[PDB]
Design a protein around this ligand. Structure first.
Ligand SMILES: Nc1ncnc2c1ncn2[C@@H]1O[C@H](COP(=O)(O)OP(=O)(O)O)[C@@H](O)[C@H]1O
Ligand SMILES: Nc1ncnc2c1ncn2[C@@H]1O[C@H](COP(=O)(O)OP(=O)(O)O)[C@@H](O)[C@H]1O
Ligand SMILES: O=P(O)(O)OC[C@H]1O[C@H](OP(=O)(O)OP(=O)(O)O)[C@H](O)[C@@H]1O
Ligand SMILES: O=P(O)(O)OC[C@H]1O[C@H](OP(=O)(O)OP(=O)(O)O)[C@H](O)[C@@H]1O
Ligand SMILES: [Cl-]
Ligand SMILES: [Cl-]
Ligand SMILES: [Cl-]
Ligand SMILES: [Cl-]
Ligand SMILES: [Cl-]
Ligand SMILES: [Cl-]
Ligand SMILES: [Mg+2]
Lengths: 205, 375, 377, 204, 377, 375
């Protein structure tokens, strides 16, 4: 396959990018959610659907030429071997520290339980606070409630999921929005195919 | 995984192939008039890392000369050694050098990179003219074309002079540049546009990352103050872009924000990528009151994309050989000697069961005549 | 400016080294030895497995920053060939050749090199003396191809002989070390003294006194010695190789059964080739151990440079002015001609400027009566 | 506040295949909500991702748990006790590649969740590899040449064939195991002993 | 900002650590243990002689720039005490104590320290169980001096027991490793299974099932086992120490003969003290090997910090103004008074400026009716 | 010589002595109002070698954090760690710190120097006044006087500010200074006078080396341009010279060409030498928008010149002990317990032959009474 391969996350990202994609002459032929590789109206573009945390991995290694993934994933995964061309202002949220409702931080050293391990260490380093970090792959709302960690680091838009599990947002780490990333080789080699699509997206924004 | 990361044996046919490539390419360079030089694996650090960048220093293993108690290093790049050689023997005129040799790195260059590459390269000293950079481009592409690869080399040009002159004519902080450079390396454009809104001339620095690829119009997008050394640099880049397309039919891309080797590169830079691989196969550029320019490549990375003719691996029959008398053995050896000169791989069996790997032919006796037949 | 025993090899010497390295490497390949190219560095676990104390001391140490573990810059490739043969060799016969740089912490000999270019071959999986004869043939094909005026003199030994006497005489660790040091220094007077007391001491003196005469050596030894098969086989082996070298290659051979350098690793026959009157042998081969049989040799290719000479090279310059006066089509023809010359091995430089001058310039390629031709300077 | 046992469980395949052992040990879940009661008031259940079970157990935020030996091998079960092989939720860790394609000339790239399992296995087979970490489903990785092979769990092979892949090597067998926090085993053994005896009984 | 398992110990915790380290060190000295203070680094030859694989991996490596040789930053002092006793110990009984920092590459336990302050004692040259009782006494004097609310719980084992069963049952290397891993995980169900097939397998199950009951353990074992003296002595040893700890120190003891951590280095009895409900034992002692007898323990002093408390300190400030108003002779008298206070352990700061304020200020030393006196803030 | 060079065991009584000194000196500092801090042996290099000189970086062994793949270091000096601590917890006011801990060097400091010193020291942050430097001088000399040494401390003062201001107001080349500094370090006066005849203000730079020792008149010998920060510096030096002579009766020498730690020292420097030894026993100075000043010493080097009271090493009689019944043993243990509190070293013998080294007394039974008697 000599054209572009686009890396995409199922659900929230796919849906919020399709208006930019349609405007760039890229419409998927089937609906992803309706039951791995997808064609598009442009024959020189195709789409890969994966978990949002694997988008940077597929892009940096070049198994996809470019992709859309949240800045939460790029910060956590490290975006060393990709180019971050465009802030797409879609799928917006924030990385925040969260704890149990109104309970104060305990006397002893803080335990943070989180997916975002490197984000946590980096943040709490910037706030001069020494912590123990515990890696979770699954949903993290449970961790405070059984004292696995005192706080967590997670994405929050409204905070309904946080309140629904008896938690509350505490500190604002940074803002989050999905970004357009491009494999470093693919940007040099296939720029001719990329330039229009980048211009459409950029116009759309 | 019994060997350190980025350290691998190259064995058997791959090893033969590597020898062949290394030798063919080395001789190609010699016939283009580049003097071969073979500097040692180790030197005192004083000489080895003179003018060395911080990345080079960190890549270079250190060891102790027990005879003097001084620091030595196992080289990570030969290029500085060629400088040293040319300092002593080069003279004021034009000098050409080629080299092939192992180098060692402390850490991999990027994703799954080798730490024990077989560095092969060429260099021209004493010529200011862009014509020297064209020669090396021609020499290189003759070498690549000789390999009969299906693999496609894509080439990327840059020019560190451009960003050097902006940083000088914007009076930049040591930290600021290091920020800009890290941002460029990551092509984090959103954050680049942010950090530029505060920094002096920062429009210009953002235009580099945003409209670098378009070398035709790049100068027109820069400030009035910007629009001498910057002006030559954009012309240089345009000349090489053309020469590669015309003379070699090469797909070229521009990126003036390629600033790997900001310390040693004194101008134009060249980065060749093989197929879709992240580490460039070839790395060349202008460096350094003596002019200098040249490239290098890891020969070992050509192994995947190059293929030799199948070899003729011949076995003599044990029994038939031993039945011969002294004089017949001499004649057979004279015949087998002839075959070896033709490049056939002939094994003289120690035992009946002695079997070479990849056996293609037998040399067998029939009615007082030795002949080859396939298995 | 460079550390002791560390030198540039430049220009024609460098070209010569490339040529030798390549020719010898290919010769070995055509004799059916598989080329293997192991790395400059390994973890010490693998690199110095079974290593002697001299080898360990010669091997520079460095730290793998990715694992915090100890690595080494190899000082000998021979162990790497063991490792390779352990993985890929199988039970049958296996042949390997190799050429590669190795690094030593200290020189071997007075002003000796610390960055030799180690080239060698090895045969695993054959007990027979026929494997040692193959390597002798392979080696001497290589040496004869070099067209040297230099004379290789060869010294054979056998560590098995002295090992069996020491075992059959029940020798103390210290006694042996005395005998060995005496042999190394050829103190015959003091050897005859220390032997008058030691058990079988007649035999240990006969080694040093009548070793060189391998024909009669067995006849001069004790009944206990002559009975033992390992001593008798060793003396036969030595006699077979002595002959084969004289007959098949016309080689000046000397025997020295008291040559016990590498008493630890050599499990039998040893070979030491000396070039002219140089103290460090140019070639060092012998029987050693993979329960796997193994035997082979190595040499520092760089030491062949003094005693080998290539034909003088043709270093050609095209005339700048004359070239630029040509039109497109004439340039094509000249390039096709220059291409042809390069294939023939001529070193043709395409000048960037009028002043562009190759070093060692032998010829000019100049235009004359509408013909490009070579003329000397 | 809660003085009884907390049980760590993975939603889906594990929960379903353990409930017969749980019912036999007097433990019936009330519902099918992050923390869950049970018929025994001194037991409760946490439902989490299967890779988090050892993390919750070793730190003691659950007293004991059920998780596959694939997770224990990958995560390392250094700070827990593996009391019982439950012979349920059985599968195998295997290397998998594209249908009939040969191994490439160059070094092998493995893409997988099971990074440490991969390095450990390919180390045991004396093969040097490049390992690439995936959190999501791995069947795609061979097909876009991210890796040459993958390491995954496989029962039947249908998911593998359905994505144009096939099993290559058998690394080891897998079955969910009963793990117990080291402190909880000393402190709350009185509560654990019956449940362990039931499970042990329901095994054979 | 600091690596995992690496922490500052500051201010009062730091003072507490100094106090503990010093008090415990002197206690040991007064019990007749010679203090020895080996260095942080040695050549690996000496440092990791007889070292396990876990010890080797825990020990950071560095290069001696003066010799190019490998050195290590120690991860345990215990080997250094062996070396010291090898040189200076002699054949008789020798006693040593030590306190010093050691470095680990990786944590032992969840969020465990990598820079522990290792303190310990050792007795060489005595076979008798009386030496193990001395160390138990020395240890418990130390612990009792700390005035902790924290409760030390002690676990005894004996690796000799399982070693003699495995020998008398002719166990395969793999079988043992299975038994050991099963024991470590207390899988009794699967242990009873694997034992039904294995020779003497009754005995190996009885260890795990009825180990805790050391009184009756020997009676439950096979005839072959009960005959053997090494098993019978081991069970006696264990019984003697169990008693001595309960009687002489009122210690809660549990037996676990399946505790085989350090199966390689422990040559008999083992001791593991746990503080409250912490997973990593606070104290680790046992019989090991110098053909020299040896036994002893160690602890990370830093882990005592949470469970020990010093009296609150008196942090005193002299008034700047009042001091400067004094004449020479009055200053002398005040300094003599402040000198006296410092000897009593008061922390008195002589202010450089009016604003100079000590942290944790408890008192002021102020002038009042021609008398310097302490008053709280 | 089984241990690396500059690495030695400290054993038995020397080890006890070292413990005692370390503890006494540490507590002395605590009672003078210095907060004890105990930073770790290792940190990430980012924190450990922040603002570090080139000599400090080279002295600091490097190792790899296996959990993050990052660079760590085994500290070679604690002083930077105290900076870090004071950055976090110190606040804007005055702060005092003391510390004792092992540090590791890659190479010896000078002739036969240790590489594993036990670094003990104190520091005052947040005071500009010379009064802080006087406090430390007093604190130090109280500590030294408490040791009851026959050994004489000789003190050397310098001031890096002086040479810093000349080099700035002479616009000096990076190389020039490094030459001057190396010459000064060697006090090669002939060659210094030579290299100064060409260099700007070079009269001044030679007067430093030639008439430094005479601090009274030093300012008068300098140029008109030289005669602000230079003027304070000569006064500072004169004040401390006096204070040491008057208050402590100390033999002081001046040397303004003492420029070890040119990178970290922001002013006055202090170097104390014990008897005729080459390596100073004590090393203090002004460093660093937060003010800071303090010293350190290798406790282990005090061992030769300090002496504790002889110890009472007591042995209980084996036979007599074993003849006792339970209740008598309790009473003897209560008595032996009492002795240990008094600091006696009492060994409970495991066997009749059990003999402590340096045995001074026996505790022996006589007519139902235990008593001490010498051997
Ligand atoms: N509730 C949310 N509202 C808006 N954006 C979100 C929300 N949760 C996540 N995001 C953003 O969308 C990205 C996609 O994540 P998501 O679709 O939730 O994948 P997954 O469920 O696999 O974690 C996240 O990386 C983050 O940037
Ligand atoms: N096909 C299978 N058959 C049996 N057991 C499986 C199978 N796949 C996985 N397992 C094991 O049982 C668990 C079931 O996987 P599941 O809970 O669906 O995974 P996840 O929580 O990651 O979505 C795994 O964690 C593994 O231990
Ligand atoms: O606080 P809120 O504004 O609700 O947003 C935060 C939520 O966003 C994600 O949930 P998502 O919608 O992806 O559902 P998920 O839990 O199924 O991932 C994430 O897991 C948080 O629970
Ligand atoms: O080879 P098979 O027997 O068909 O099974 C293989 C699949 O089963 C497992 O989980 P599954 O996909 O069933 O569910 P999960 O993705 O939720 O783990 C596994 O992750 C594989 O994808
Ligand atoms: Cl080669
Ligand atoms: Cl004689
Ligand atoms: Cl010799
Ligand atoms: Cl049972
Ligand atoms: Cl344990
Ligand atoms: Cl101490
Ligand atoms: Mg989500």
């Amino acid at each position: 396959f000599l054209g572009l391969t686009l890396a995409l996350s199922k659900g929230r990202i796919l849906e919020e990018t399709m208006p930019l994609l349609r405007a760039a002459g890229v419409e998927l032929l089937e609906d992803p959610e309706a039951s791995l590789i997808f064609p598009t109206s442009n024959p020189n573009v195709r789409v890969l659907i994966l978990r949002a945390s694997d988008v940077p991995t597929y892009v940096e290694h070049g198994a996809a030429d470019f992709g859309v993934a949240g800045k939460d994933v790029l910060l956590e995964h490290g975006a060393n071997h990709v180019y971050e061309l465009l802030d797409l202002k879609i799928a917006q949220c924030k990385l925040m520290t969260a704890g149990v409702k109104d309970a104060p931080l305990p006397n002893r050293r803080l335990r943070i339980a989180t997916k975002y391990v490197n984000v946590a260490r980096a943040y709490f380093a910037s706030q001069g606070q020494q912590v123990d970090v515990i890696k979770l792959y699954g949903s993290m709302e449970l961790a405070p409630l059984v004292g696995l960690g005192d706080l967590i680091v997670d994405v929050v838009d409204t905070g309904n999921t946080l309140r629904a599990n008896g938690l509350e947002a505490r500190d604002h780490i940074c803002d989050v929005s999905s970004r357009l990333i491009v494999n470093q080789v693919s940007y040099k080699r296939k720029f001719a195919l990329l330039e229009p699509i980048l211009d459409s997206f950029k116009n759309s924004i | 995984g019994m060997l350190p990361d980025g350290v691998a044996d190259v064995l058997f046919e791959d090893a033969h192939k590597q020898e062949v490539l290394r030798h063919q390419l080395t001789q190609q360079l010699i016939t283009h008039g580049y003097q071969l030089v073979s500097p040692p694996m180790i030197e005192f650090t004083e000489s080895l890392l003179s003018g060395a960048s911080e990345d080079l220093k960190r890549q270079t293993f250190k060891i102790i000369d027990q005879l003097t108690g001084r620091l030595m290093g196992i080289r990570a790049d030969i290029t500085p050694q060629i400088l040293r050689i040319d300092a002593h023997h080069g003279g004021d005129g034009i000098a050409r050098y080629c080299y092939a040799g192992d180098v060692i790195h402390t850490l991999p260059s990027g994703l799954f990179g080798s730490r024990t590459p077989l560095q092969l390269g060429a260099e021209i000293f004493g010529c200011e003219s862009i014509a020297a950079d064209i020669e090396l481009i021609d020499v290189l592409f003759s070498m690549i074309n000789s390999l009969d690869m299906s693999a496609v080399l894509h080439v990327d040009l840059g020019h560190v002079t451009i960003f050097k002159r902006l940083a000088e004519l914007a009076a930049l902080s040591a930290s600021d540049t290091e920020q800009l450079m890290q941002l460029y390396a990551n092509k984090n454009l959103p954050e680049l546009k942010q950090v530029c809104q505060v920094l002096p001339m920062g429009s210009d620095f953002y235009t580099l990352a945003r409209f670098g690829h378009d070398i035709a119009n790049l100068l027109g997008r820069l400030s009035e103050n910007a629009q001498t050394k910057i002006v030559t640099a954009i012309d240089e880049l345009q000349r090489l872009k053309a020469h590669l397309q015309v003379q070699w039919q090469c797909a070229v891309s521009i990126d003036v924000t390629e600033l790997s080797g900001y310390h040693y590169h004194t101008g134009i830079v060249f980065n060749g990528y093989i197929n879709s691989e992240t580490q460039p196969l070839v790395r060349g550029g202008r460096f350094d009151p003596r002019q200098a320019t040249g490239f290098s490549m890891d020969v070992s990375r050509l192994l995947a994309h190059t293929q030799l003719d199948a070899p003729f691996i011949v076995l003599i029959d044990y029994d038939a050989f031993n039945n011969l008398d002294s004089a017949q053995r001499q004649l057979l050896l004279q015949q087998v000697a002839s075959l070896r000169q033709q490049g056939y791989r002939v094994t003289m069996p120690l035992t009946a069961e002695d079997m070479p790997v990849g056996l293609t032919h037998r040399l067998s006796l029939a009615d007082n005549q030795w002949r080859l037949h396939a298995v």
